[model samples]
Target: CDIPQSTNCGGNVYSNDDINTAIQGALDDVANGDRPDNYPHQYYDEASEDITLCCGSGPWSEFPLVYNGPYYSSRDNYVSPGPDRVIYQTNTGEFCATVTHTGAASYDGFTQCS
Candidate 1:
């Protein structure tokens, strides 16, 4: 088990806005049941709520990884999983993040990299 996301959310963690922007775009498309093709990894099954914010940092470098961190709400409320943050290391680079949360609307959070 890795260190929890909220555990490192004090002020030392960070995020990538460009990636988040693209992620949100994909989320929006999925939320509306519109396969925009930009985010193949993101798929919205028309869940109960809309897109929420998510943020975290990590040293991971893979896909299909499980989220093992405390993903908080826009108001810093903890999501159900209780902070299981994982960093997906892509060929581009190590991608870690900290995003905003939404009750049931949109994800407007961002990352703060060091």
Candidate 2:
């Protein structure tokens, strides 16, 4: 996958492709069963257009989810400041996905894309 010089939620430019691609990769990994050291679980809120990818023993609960690998946690949930975007928070830090339709979505942090 190609990483574009996209803008993240904090106005710090990062890179990635469509949101679907990133989420789909997580979906695919979870669907494949399990791994030696890590197992991933995912949640998709169609109504809110939010998708969460968590790696560990799930069902995901918060930004921290159930694992320490890759995830996010929030104290309160509110309407995102931007439309067509989803919040991205992980062990590294926090950010959001600001675009999806253009086939390029901004991942606001030190994200590893597969």
Candidate 3:
């Protein structure tokens, strides 16, 4: 799907929709009460395109499209209280994007995508 976004994650194989979906998924988990009540769930303000990713109880503000790469999976971690890491991967297991937040309470974007 073709969606309007402001950044490229860094891969030709994936589209903006893929990354957005992953980002949204992470945010959704918090909204749906899937994550810990003390977790810093993300909230997106569509009007400004601002995203808030929480590290514990800290809120980190930044853009939506952080990084893009080979493959990523938006899986949640329950045992550890740390940054939020969402991995976005393709169906073919070819492309992936590792989107993460820092303990510093900031979105670190993609690291291996480039």
Candidate 4:
């Protein structure tokens, strides 16, 4: 599937094609149906403060879209490869957009891409 928008992470620009790859990988992870926060978890309005509006509507989910590694997490002790992430609609599996923590002022916070 194609993402709705591209992303810019500290100069690492990602087209929808590039980011869709990450989105697919993460979808495969959640395809098994788990809600581990370490895994793709629900994204709420409160947490929306952590990143840009996804445009995916309510009842959304999020997962890490890393620059490296097979998997990623927000676990306290781990070092996330980068702050990139993918958002999707739980009901339709449609790709939303890419967001990055690369330049967020607060930890886990993110900004939109072009």
- The superposed Cα distance between candidate 2 and the true structure at residue 109, in angstroms, equals 12
Q: Judging by TM-score, tell me the better candidate of 1 and 3.
A: 3
Better of 1 and 3 by lDDT: 3
Q: What TM-score, computed on C-alpha atoms, does each candidate reach?
A: 0.20, 0.23, 0.26, 0.64
Pick the winner on TM-score between candidates 1 and 4.
4
lDDT of 2 by residue, 28-97 (tens): 3323223321322222334343443333333431121111123221234322222123223223222333
Better of 1 and 2 by TM-score: 2
Over 3-104, each residue of candidate 3 has an lDDT whose tens digit, in order, gives: 323332333233556456544544443343343443223433233313332232323322233234212223352334233333322121111233334322
- For model 4, residues 28-89, the per-residue Cα lDDT tens digits are 66432333436567755445445555455756766666654345554454655466777777
Clashing pairs in 2: 63-72, 63-73, 64-72, 64-73
Error of 4 at 65 (Å): 2.1
Using lDDT, give the best candidate's number. Answer: 4
Ranking by TM-score: 4, 3, 2, 1
Model 4: lDDT equals 0.61
- The local lDDT score (0 to 100) that residue 6 gets in candidate 2 is 55
Q: Give candidate 3's TM-score.
A: 0.26
TM-score of model number 1: 0.20
Q: Considering every candidate listed, which one attains the maximal TM-score? A: 4
Query: Native-vs-model 1 lDDT?
Result: 0.28
Error of 2 at 12 (Å): 5.0
Model 4's C-alpha root-mean-square deviation from the true structure amounts to: 4.5
